[PDB]
Write a protein that binds this ligand. Structure first.
Ligand SMILES: C[N+](C)(C)C[C@@H](O)CC(=O)O
Length: 272
């Protein structure tokens, strides 16, 4: 009886996956295995449907609402979460838990020099010379329905000069070093504050909310009745500002996700 915890290929997914793994083994006689390097929410969900994972560490409400459930991008945090919770329960008997306490949203990120020099505050301010710009984005966002590029173009009414898809990890330096004029960063990445970068305002509210939660089949929670109490320790416990520091511990200071998670868990006494 080994619990299989899925980690997406994001620093944040890996930290949180370890944090779950360690809290389980501390509180239980259940032992754990991490399934690393799932490329996306789709990969994660597919893996859960086939029994390959028992717990998703990091799922985001807007992402699964638009892709896995095939729904419109609901723009309200609370409403988005409810539809996602009721749909997972109703559709797969999966439990989409309440969030850890943090939203990890797509954010248009620029250097401050660039925003001074181009008079930029908002995503709409980009429109003026948009075709002059190089945008850095992740390997999937351009192909996404609902919350992807196509949606952005029909919402903000403009497109960028060129778009470059890369690994999300690398957009923080590419924007900093001038290789890109703007990137679509993730808001919880600690390098944004660490590089004194500017988040632009989503003035048209194109993006749905992206509250982060764990997901486990009830089938699993039935079997291991002591498991839900463990996950519950972490519910509402990590705000965006905490997640930003944790992320940076791996990203800036180059620590193993397991070390970061253990240090976090030690600091809060494993929450009893
Ligand atoms: C992190 N974000 C919420 C913006 C999206 C992402 O996780 C996409 C996915 O899981 O494929």
């Amino acid at each position: 009886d080994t619990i299989k915890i899925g980690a997406q290929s994001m620093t944040e997914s890996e930290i949180v996956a370890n944090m779950i793994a360690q809290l389980i083994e501390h509180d239980t006689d259940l032992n754990t295995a991490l399934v690393k390097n799932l490329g996306s929410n789709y990969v994660q969900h597919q893996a859960m449907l086939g029994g390959d994972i028992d717990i998703s560490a990091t799922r985001y409400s807007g992402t699964d609402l638009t892709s896995t459930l095939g729904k419109e991008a609901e723009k309200d945090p609370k409403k988005a979460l409810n539809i996602v919770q009721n749909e997972f329960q109703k559709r797969f008997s999966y439990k989409w838990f309440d969030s850890y306490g943090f939203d990890n949203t797509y954010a248009f990120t620029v250097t401050k020099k660039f925003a001074e020099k181009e008079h930029i505050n908002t995503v709409s301010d980009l429109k003026k010379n948009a075709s002059q710009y190089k945008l850095g984005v992740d390997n999937a966002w351009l192909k996404r329905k609902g919350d992807g590029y196509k949606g952005f173009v029909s919402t903000y009414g403009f497109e960028f000069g060129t778009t470059y898809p890369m690994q999300i990890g690398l957009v923080y330096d590419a924007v900093k070093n001038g290789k890109m004029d703007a990137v679509l960063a993730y808001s919880t990445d600690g390098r944004i504050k660490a590089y004194d970068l500017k988040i632009l305002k989503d003035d048209k509210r194109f993006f749905p909310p992206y509250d982060c939660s764990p997901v486990i089949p009830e089938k699993v929670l039935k079997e291991h009745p002591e498991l839900e109490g463990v996950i519950n320790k972490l519910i509402g416990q990590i705000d965006t500002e905490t997640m930003q520091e944790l992320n940076y511990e791996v990203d800036g200071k180059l620590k193993e996700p397991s070390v970061v998670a253990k240090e976090f868990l030690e600091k809060h006494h494993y929450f009893d």
